[PDB]
Ligand binder design. Structure first.
Ligand SMILES: *[C@@H]1O[C@H](CO)[C@@H](O[C@@H]2O[C@H](CO)[C@@H](O)[C@H](O)[C@H]2NC(C)=O)[C@H](O)[C@H]1NC(C)=O
Ligand code: NAG
Length: 287
């Protein structure tokens, strides 16, 4: 279970469907993938050695995405799906596109990051929303940090047009919920992949995002005064069959070599300590 409130009793079983699959491709940071722009700092036509919360080049991704229709397993809401959140995570999220009657729909999983997922604690929720306005799909990423009464089996649903056997049910709060942060961010419904950095430092949670390149940009930060310990990528239920991807690899404090072009755009990155060839590159001066 995620939270400790039973929100549903309909079509819940104890079926084992397998563990999260591992990508055949490892973490590759060469083009800037896995890095983010430095907050309030513009570097132009230069190379920079700096410390941040980065993935490790050569390491693996796990596909944490879960998709069902009606039947949901209790095991989907336990480890290894419910996972540890230490320093942070880097995410490569597939924007699954589905076309029905001339309308393209955008679908990908929501994620929650918290400790106990009980309303005596704050939980981070990053959830997509879509609507069709004048035959053109609009997309929003809703990010909130609230004392949610999270459900035991939290899940989202697809756009109503694609068909649903279940209702959206990931928390249950009929009163006023205390939130430290909440707002909507736009996302490109036509993007192939969305990239995220989520990390914590000195009691402060940070979020970075992009869907227009491979280098993420600062969205927001919030002071919690506590340490987050777990993350969970929520199942998405839909009557339409589709394949979802939410690739996750951990972040740790690492020294990277970043290359910025004349416009201040990151075009190259080296994970200095990932192997000896990278160590050579970083030892050869550059800041
Ligand atoms: C972000 O945008 C979404 C979608 O417009 C907002 O969610 C709606 O909130 C209203 C008022 O509470 C409800 O009547 C709708 O049912 C909600 N729609 C959906 C799809 O959830 C949300 O309030 C916005 N968040 C913030 C922080 O402004
Ligand atoms: C960029 O920096 C390099 C040194 O690494 C220098 O040769 C070049 O003149 C600079 N270009 C611009 C447009 O400032």
């Amino acid at each position: 279970v995620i939270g400790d409130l039973k929100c549903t009793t309909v079509s819940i079983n104890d079926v084992d469907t397998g563990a999260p699959s591992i990508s055949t491709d490892t973490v590759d940071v060469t083009n800037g993938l896995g890095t983010y722009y430095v907050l309030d700092r513009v570097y132009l036509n230069t190379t920079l050695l700096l410390n941040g919360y980065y993935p490790t080049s050569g390491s693996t991704y796990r596909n944490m995405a879960l998709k069902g229709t009606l039947l949901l397993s209790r095991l989907w809401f336990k480890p290894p799906f419910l996972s540890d959140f230490i320093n942070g995570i880097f995410a490569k999220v597939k924007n699954t596109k589905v076309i029905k009657k001339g309308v393209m729909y955008s679908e990908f999983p929501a994620i929650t990051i918290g400790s106990t997922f009980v309303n005596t604690s704050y939980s981070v929720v990053v959830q997509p929303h879509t609507t069709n306005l004048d035959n053109k799909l609009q997309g929003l990423l809703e990010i909130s940090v609230c004392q949610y009464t999270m459900c035991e089996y939290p899940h989202t649903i697809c756009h109503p047009k694609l068909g649903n056997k279940r209702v959206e049910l990931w928390h249950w709060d009929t009163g006023v919920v205390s939130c430290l942060y909440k707002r909507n961010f736009t996302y490109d419904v036509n993007a192939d992949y969305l990239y995220f950095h989520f990390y914590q430092e000195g009691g402060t949670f940070y979020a970075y995002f992009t869907d227009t390149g491979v280098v993420t940009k600062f969205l927001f930060n919030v002071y919690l005064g506590t340490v987050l310990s777990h993350y969970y990528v929520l199942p998405l239920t839909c009557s339409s069959a589709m394949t979802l991807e939410y690739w996750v690899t951990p972040l740790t404090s690492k020294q990277y070599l970043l290359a910025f072009n004349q416009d201040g755009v990151i075009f190259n990155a080296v994970d200095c300590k990932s192997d000896f060839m990278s160590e050579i590159k970083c030892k050869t001066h550059h800041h």
